[PDB]
Structure formats: structure tokens, C-alpha cells
Design a protein around this nucleic acid. Sequence first.
RNA 1: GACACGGUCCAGACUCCUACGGGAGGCAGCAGUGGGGAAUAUUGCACAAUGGGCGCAAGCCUGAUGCAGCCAUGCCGCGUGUAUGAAGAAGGCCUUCGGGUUGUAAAGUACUUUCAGCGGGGAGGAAGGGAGUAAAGUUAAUACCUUUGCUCAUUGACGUUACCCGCAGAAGAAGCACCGGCUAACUCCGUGCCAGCAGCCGCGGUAAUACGGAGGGUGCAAGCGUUAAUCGGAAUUACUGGGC
RNA 2: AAAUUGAAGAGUUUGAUCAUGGCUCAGAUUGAACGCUGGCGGCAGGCCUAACACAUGCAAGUCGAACGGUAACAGGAAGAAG
Lengths: 118, 205
Amino acid sequence: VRKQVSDGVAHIHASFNNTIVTITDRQGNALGWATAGGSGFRGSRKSTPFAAQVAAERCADAVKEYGIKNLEVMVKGPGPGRESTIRALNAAGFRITNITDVTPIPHNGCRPPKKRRV
Amino acid sequence: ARYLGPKLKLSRREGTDLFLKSGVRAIDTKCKIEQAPGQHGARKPRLSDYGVQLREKQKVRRIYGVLERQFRNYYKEAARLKGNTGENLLALLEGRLDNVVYRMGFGATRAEARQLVSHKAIMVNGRVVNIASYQVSPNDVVSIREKAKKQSRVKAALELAEQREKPTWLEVDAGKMEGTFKRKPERSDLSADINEHLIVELYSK
RNA sequence: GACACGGUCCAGACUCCUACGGGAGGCAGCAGUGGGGAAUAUUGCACAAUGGGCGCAAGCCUGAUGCAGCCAUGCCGCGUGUAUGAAGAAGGCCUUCGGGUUGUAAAGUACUUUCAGCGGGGAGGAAGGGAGUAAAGUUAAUACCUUUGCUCAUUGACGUUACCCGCAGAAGAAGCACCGGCUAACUCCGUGCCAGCAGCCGCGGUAAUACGGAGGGUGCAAGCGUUAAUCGGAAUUACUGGGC
RNA sequence: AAAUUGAAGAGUUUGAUCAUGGCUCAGAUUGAACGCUGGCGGCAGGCCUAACACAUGCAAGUCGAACGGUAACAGGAAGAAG
Ligand SMILES: [Mg+2]
Ligand SMILES: [Mg+2]
Ligand SMILES: [Mg+2]
Ligand SMILES: [Mg+2]
Ligand SMILES: [Mg+2]
Ligand SMILES: [Mg+2]
Ligand SMILES: [Mg+2]
Ligand SMILES: [Mg+2]
Ligand SMILES: [Mg+2]
Ligand SMILES: [Mg+2]
Ligand SMILES: [Mg+2]
Ligand SMILES: [Mg+2]
């Protein structure tokens, strides 16, 4: 039942309000995830780079469930947390092989929301 | 006619882990990689020229459990056949029934999938074959024997097959418990860490 | 069709028998015996098939031939399990005395039963002729035949066959050579130019990666080694392809 | 279509070098043997020695539709019989 597998990939959704850390295999089947909002951080605390690192600490689970060891890194989103989280993976005992940005950049696609006059 | 000793010893020797053991439990945990066996293994061995050639040949053989005598017969056939010999030799090694069953996903290990073939549990084109070295020809359909399917080990091996990027030239069937050896494999698909030109020279010496 | 392997005549040697008067024999056919040598198989089965001889045929005749037995002698295939399994069990050996090493090897825990165990089925080799039939050709008579078709019953030495199916339980199945260089793979102990090894280079004279033992490791595998032999490498008799 | 296609060195002469020139090694391969070990099957092979001697059984017989025959058998009829 509880399986075991290495050579994963980590998808990083660095949004302006939250950071989503998901560890998955090479074929997109999710193995585990953790979020800043689910790590005890709300409001401003839910977006600070630090809390994003803390979210990674949670994702350090699945160890016995999946011996990922070496994993890929996918990063998308301009929000804070494009650096912190990455460190936490190293300090957790993981082999970061490649680091690439997968931020969606339209070539003049859909119309964006209007500006916040505030 | 078969290797029966420990497996992690060979794995950690010759260095790069290449398709051994069930494939679930992390390879590093079971042993100590980057350290050849033996009391003196913890040292840097200045390999030679013969050394490199020998290692490659030994490595290739173990990946497919082919004994020298057998492997040499493949080399003679590969040289006889038209085309580049090294890829032809690799194609012949991949075309063995036991290897194909392993890649098809019915066995956790090449040895276990080979045992499934040996124990008369595999059907090819409606004919019972229990010879691991049988050469599968293109467009053939390999189907697990009705009785065999009741083995829960086969079922679990299917599950794990998902992690290995399904070989293109093999059309695997899940619940259908069948496979179609579409065509011969190509060098590109095979692990790019194999230098077949080294193998060709070594046996041509 | 022979100067004739199981024909004859003669001579020679040997072989054996005889009632002494006289005879008989020739496995370089198949088994086999002794001998020789390092070293080569069962005094097997059946003519079922093929093949040949004779016979109208039916047949009979086959140590030809088909099979079987023996030897790992070679070639080829196969199996001796599969996964889990680390407080890296103990034990072994090393040890910088901290450890490491064996080794996930084991044990254990799931799992499977190839072949070998046993049991029960079951092709193919099998074509044939015979007995009949009916018609046809064949006649004086289409009697005789011979040609068809058919009909019945047929024959397998191998053979407890090829193969299939069930039975049970990892149970019954791994050695051999090497680890100084060439040449892949190392230390410890013993020994002290002793004993020894040695394809070449050479080791050993008291801290031997070379001998001997231990652990470990490398190659190959139901085989691994040694020896003998042929070619290669050896452009080292060179025509390709050499020199003085 | 295809059947034309493959060609490696190394160690040893010296204080060191080049050169000629040996020997030796790796590779194939056998109608092999010996040693150690040895589960099974398929296929092939198996006195290279003394054409040395050979115990013994067998390896060329068949044909009655060539003929005198009927030795042995089967029946067959006669003749008889408790
Ligand atoms: Mg004659
Ligand atoms: Mg004779
Ligand atoms: Mg004889
Ligand atoms: Mg008889
Ligand atoms: Mg006879
Ligand atoms: Mg059996
Ligand atoms: Mg070496
Ligand atoms: Mg073999
Ligand atoms: Mg020789
Ligand atoms: Mg020459
Ligand atoms: Mg010269
Ligand atoms: Mg006779």
C-alpha cells in the first residue's frame, strides 16, 4: 500500500498572497503538499518568505512514504518565496538537480484585470 | 547458469546503479553507494584501459543477466547482421523474453520477471514459452497466462511499472494484462550511458 | 561386373581340434575379448520408416538403417528460487580500537513451483499391403487379370514417446581458477634464499599485495583449470609485406 | 534488395635512450587427456595407439509361379478299427 519512489519534482506556486509547495513524481502524480496558510500563518504572515520556508518543513514528510532524495524544482509566480523555500529543501536533506522558472508568461493573451486605483 | 549471490554487492560495484532490485525501497538506504565492496574498497582505484572495457562489458551483462558464452553468441550474431553492431547487440539483448516481460511491467525485477517466464506463466501468441532467451519479434502480442494473473506479485509489478517511463516500442495493457512488441527499440531510448563502440572493440580484440 | 572382406587353389606364419589317420580358422562388418596407450561407448532394440537382395505377389532376408545405452567429450538450452527484509543480527576477518568488512548476505516474512518428484492423459512419425467390393481397360467368354474408386480390419523398434494436465513443497540441484607486473581483482597470519611459486618478468635472506593459511575480492560457470596440438599476434621467410 | 567488410598489442637486452633481433603473453580452435567439481534436457561425436592378436553370436540371402521332391507340418479322401 504505502509505496516508495525517488526522482521527484517540486512545483512552487509563488503567488503574491500565498506559497504552494507540492512534491510530485516525474509524471505529475502528487505525493505531498504543504501551504503557508496551513502552517499556522494568516494575513501578512501567509506571504512572507519565512513562512514559505516553514511550509517546506511540513513537506519534509513523505520521507518513508517516498524516498525522493533527488528532486526537480519548478517555480512559477512572482510573489515572495522564490528563494526561501528553495533553501529549506536543501536543509531538509534533498538533492536539488535543476532549478527552472515555469512562470506563465502570455504573449499578449487574455486581458488582465484593471488597475487598483486604491 | 544464473547469479545467485547478493545483489547490492554488484550494484555498488561498477558504480552507477543500473536497473537492479525491486526498485521501490531507496537504493541508497539498502547499501553504501560510491564504495566498491571489499575491505580495501574504501580507496580510489586508478583504473586502467583493460579495466574500463571490462567494467562496461560486465555492467551490460548484469543489467540483462547474460552469461559470457551467451553474450558472445549475441556479439557474433550482431557482427553478422547488417548495420552498426553495437545497437544491433543492444536490440538483441532488449528482445529477450525475460527483459521484455520486465519492461512490460509484469515483474518487479528482471530476475523475478524471468522467474515468471521460467515457471511457465507467460503466453506468447497462444503458445507457452518458458525460455527467457526467446527472441520476441515485432508486432507480437504477449499475454499473461490466465492462471498466472491470479498471482498478486504480478499485479503489484504492474503498479510499479508506471514510474518507469513506459518504453515507446512497447504497448502495455493494464487490465488487459497484455503487451504488443510494436517494433525493435532504438539507441536513443536506451540509457545514453552505454558506449556500444567500446563493447565492439573489446570483443574484436 | 572380382583376380572377390564373411568364394576357391597354393605357399608362409600363427590359431584350434582329432580317436594321430587328419582336419578346420582369419572381427581393417556389429557388439566384444586381451594387449597397447595419457585416452575413446552396449556382447542393446526393431526392421515400425527408409534403403537394398530374392520373389508375380504375399512375403523372407538387413549389426545397412532407424532407435536406445555409456562419457559434461563438444555445441545449445535450462534450473539450482522471487520480493521484502539493518538496532547493518551474530559470527568471520581487519582495525586508527573508534570502527569498518562480510552484507539484505542471513535469519525472518510474504511469494512461486521450471525441470527433476509423482500421478493422469496424448500427437506425430504411418506410407503401406491384405481382405473385400463395384465399375472401367483388358475378352471367345469383357471369365483371367489390371486400373480406378470405394468397404472392413489393419501394422511404431523407439515408447512409461513430442506434448498436455493435476499433485506437493524452496523444497532435490555451484563449483573452479585467479587477485606482483603483463592482466580484472588485497590485506592479515605463518615462513625466513628455508619451504616453496614460476607463461614472461621474477619472488623468498625476519614488517612476503608473488610462497603457505585466513578473510576479502576478480573472472568463468555445470563446468573451471593444467597439459598437448594448429593458426593468429609473428611485417619473425615479407607475393601482397623485410633486409644486406 | 541481400549475399564485396575488415586488419589492436604487451612484457623482457640499458644507469637511462633509440634500433635491430629474439623468446614470452593475451585470441581463436580439437576425433583431446588429466585434476577438481558436477542438476537436467536437446543436438552432435566417441581406439588418433598395435592393418596387433582375437573367446563367442550376428552382419546374404531368397525364389515351389524353374524342377525332380515331400524331409516336417497342416489339412484332405479312402480304408478300417475298442
Ligand atoms: Mg565377398
Ligand atoms: Mg571378416
Ligand atoms: Mg569390432
Ligand atoms: Mg527381436
Ligand atoms: Mg539383427
Ligand atoms: Mg518435472
Ligand atoms: Mg590489476
Ligand atoms: Mg553451458
Ligand atoms: Mg600453446
Ligand atoms: Mg608472415
Ligand atoms: Mg628487419
Ligand atoms: Mg541372421
